């Protein structure tokens, strides 16, 4: 079970999860491929906002997704 996930630079990711994987653990994966703080970010799967506590079956996700990575600013 590999997923996929696009940041906000246009890259491209591979990762390696389960349906069982928690968005905490899914979101830490991709700071050691990418340098990514949990500031100005937040993961969301077809426009679905995901965030900590739940699990990918949870949100439904299955294998080979392709997901979305968000922030939101006032200062600009």
Do not use: C, W
């Not at 996930?5 to 899914?26: A, C, M, Q, R, Y």
């Not at 799967?45 to 739940?54: I, P, S, V």
């Not at 699990?55 to 968000?70: A, G, P, R």
Request: charged share 30%; proline share 4%; no cysteine.
């Amino acid at each position: 079970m590999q997923i996929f996930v696009k940041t906000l630079t246009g890259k491209t990711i591979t990762l390696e999860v389960e349906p069982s994987d928690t968005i905490e653990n899914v979101k830490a994966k991709i700071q050691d491929k990418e340098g990514i703080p949990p500031d100005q970010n937040r993961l969301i799967f077809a426009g679905k906002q995901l965030e900590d506590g739940r699990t990918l079956s949870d949100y439904n996700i299955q294998k080979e997704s392709t997901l979305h990575l968000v922030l939101r600013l006032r200062g600009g």
